[PDB]
Design a protein around this nucleic acid. Structure first.
Ligand SMILES: [Mg+2]
Ligand SMILES: [Mg+2]
Ligand SMILES: [Mg+2]
Ligand SMILES: [Mg+2]
Ligand SMILES: [Mg+2]
Ligand SMILES: [Mg+2]
Ligand SMILES: [Mg+2]
Ligand SMILES: [Mg+2]
Ligand SMILES: [Mg+2]
Ligand SMILES: [Mg+2]
Ligand SMILES: [Mg+2]
Lengths: 115, 60, 177, 84
RNA sequence: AGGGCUACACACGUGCUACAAUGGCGCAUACAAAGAGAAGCGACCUCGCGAGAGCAAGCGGACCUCAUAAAGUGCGUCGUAGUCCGGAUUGGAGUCUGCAACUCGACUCCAUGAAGUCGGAAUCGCUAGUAAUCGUGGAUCAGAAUGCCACGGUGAAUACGU
């Protein structure tokens, strides 16, 4: 019901429900459930509190949630302070991995800005 | 206190994950089951680099 | 109370011999706790303040007071006397029980919790803190939350200075970073 | 990225220039066109003037830039906004 | 030699991928055609989650290799949610080619999970093995296709009439 400081859906299968945690995708979800002896198609509601503590300990082995957010922010901020090309692309809100900007680039640039 | 205006404020039970049980008055009605208490949180107990990053992939 | 016992037994002695106090009432006391909710979204729907007040009653265990706009303010479409908040003053047994609840259940339940500031002293030994969300309390149920309402918490003390205030709040192991 | 089994890449001439610069104690800004060379630990504290296409831009090397390429710190394109 | 042709308030053309249940995911299991290969195609076996790596057959080919077709079918699950839809963007960690991937490669893994719920005026293709949909190959090429050229699989609707 509550893992890593957030609530996870009780009605969902365990593999799907664990992905609500920032930092846990499907692969990590399957690994966590395999290492806690819990089946994947088990709804979170029908889990003993002891099983939930097992899941909490398994999640504890990964960096998730606010810790992960701080890590990601620190990496971007380091890039931006460094002044490298990647950091400058982060500063201006432009594509960072070499994509075209003559057209597209709307995820980084956002909605169109009329002249 | 006044009469009949206040939430039912009865003593409940509250059991943590690390085995911590506190007998608490609160206005929930049922008992409490919580993941992390004051005695098992990272900050309460005091549990809250680029040369290394470069050299982790750079065994010369 | 349970933490009043802790105060009276340990905190008084430790603060006495740390601060060279003459009399036991020179030691800081925790005199009251005030919890409020700025619910100026009541302007739109009165039902809001009603739900915020019920949340506060669940959290604190005593019925709150509906607080009114002291003036008419043109920046929020509020007149003098329009209800835009709640408040509960806890003293004695209830405030001590709330202090224990908040310290030992509530603050572990705050997302990304990394300690509360020690610079949040008003200047005269009174500490205030916010609560982005209310679920941090187990007294509020989650599968029913109508909206995400935080609250403010202030601890008035007899501590004349911020130092004496931190010292007292630390004797209870208040999570200061 | 370059494969780890190959090790990092750096031009030999710039590697020798840096080795001399650390040896003489020198802090005369090092002129180079090797935008493709990796920044090495012994470069820290040196000033490397990296060509950007038309001019060498001074890059005072810090600890955090180790592992990057020199060219990451000499932008080649000039842009100040449209309708400016 | 280094940079640029890869810029980015913006406007248009041609495409790809979607917005899901006639679907997504998992397990199992059917049925092609065409083509390429010697500084090349590279099996089996071992190692790696994987991209790949190591060792190393065979083949200048109806023989060896690329190279299990995919849609399909069976069983399970999801249950109409911005979702077990979508896969953009970004962080970290890598592989390979190549003197060299910063500008500016492709690909992999972990994490992230944007817009999008079928598109205004307008406008395009198609009359049958066609459209639609599904994979496969080749040229160019060290590396670098959603493009181009080519190949099969499944397989419609409609045509009163001028
Ligand atoms: Mg590109
Ligand atoms: Mg061009
Ligand atoms: Mg998907
Ligand atoms: Mg070829
Ligand atoms: Mg042939
Ligand atoms: Mg939307
Ligand atoms: Mg829908
Ligand atoms: Mg015709
Ligand atoms: Mg096709
Ligand atoms: Mg090629
Ligand atoms: Mg066809």
């Amino acid at each position: 019901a509550r893992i890593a400081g957030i609530n996870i859906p009780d009605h969902k299968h365990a593999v799907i429900a664990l992905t609500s945690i920032y930092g846990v995708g499907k692969t990590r979800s399957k690994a966590i459930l395999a290492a806690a002896g819990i089946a994947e198609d088990v709804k979170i509601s029908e889990l003993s509190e002891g099983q939930i503590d097992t899941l909490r300990d398994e999640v504890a082995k990964f960096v998730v949630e606010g810790d992960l957010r701080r890590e990601i922010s620190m990496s971007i901020k380091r890039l931006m302070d460094l002044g490298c090309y990647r950091g400058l692309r982060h500063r201006r809100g432009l594509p960072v991995r070499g994509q075209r900007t003559k057209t597209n680039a709307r995820t980084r640039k956002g909605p169109r800005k009329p002249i | 206190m006044k009469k009949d205006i206040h939430p039912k404020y009865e003593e409940i039970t509250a059991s943590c994950s690390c085995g911590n049980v506190m007998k608490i008055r609160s206005t929930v009605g049922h008992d409490l089951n919580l993941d992390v208490c004051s005695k098992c949180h990272p900050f309460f107990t005091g549990k809250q680099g680029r040369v290394d990053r470069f050299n982790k992939r750079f065994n010369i | 109370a349970k933490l009043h016992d802790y105060y009276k037994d340990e905190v008084v002695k430790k603060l006495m011999t740390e601060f060279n106090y003459n009399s036991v009432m020179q030691v800081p006391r925790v005199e009251k706790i005030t919890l409020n909710m700025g619910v100026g979204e009541a302007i739109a729907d009165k039902k809001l303040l009603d739900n915020a007040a019920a949340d506060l009653a669940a959290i604190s265990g005593q019925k709150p007071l509906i607080t009114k706009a002291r003036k008419s303010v043109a920046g929020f479409k509020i007149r003098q006397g329009y209800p835009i908040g709640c408040k509960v003053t806890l003293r004695g047994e209830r405030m001590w029980e709330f202090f224990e609840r908040l310290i030992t259940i509530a603050v572990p339940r705050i997302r990304d919790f990394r300690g509360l500031s020690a610079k949040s002293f008003d200047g005269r030994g009174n500490y205030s803190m916010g609560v982005r969300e209310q679920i941090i309390f187990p007294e509020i149920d989650y599968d029913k939350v109508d909206r995400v309402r935080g609250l403010d918490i202030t601890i008035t003390t007899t501590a004349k200075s911020d130092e004496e205030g931190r010292a007292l709040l630390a004797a209870f192991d208040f999570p200061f970073r | 990225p370059r494969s780890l089994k190959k090790g990092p890449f750096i031009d030999l001439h710039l590697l020798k220039k840096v080795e001399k610069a650390v040896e003489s104690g020198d802090k005369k800004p090092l002129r180079t066109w090797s935008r493709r060379s990796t920044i090495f630990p012994n470069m820290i504290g040196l000033t490397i003037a990296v060509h950007n296409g038309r001019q060498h831009v001074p890059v005072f090397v810090t600890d955090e830039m180790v592992g990057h390429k020199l060219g990451e710190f000499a932008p080649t394109r000039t842009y100040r906004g449209h309708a400016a």
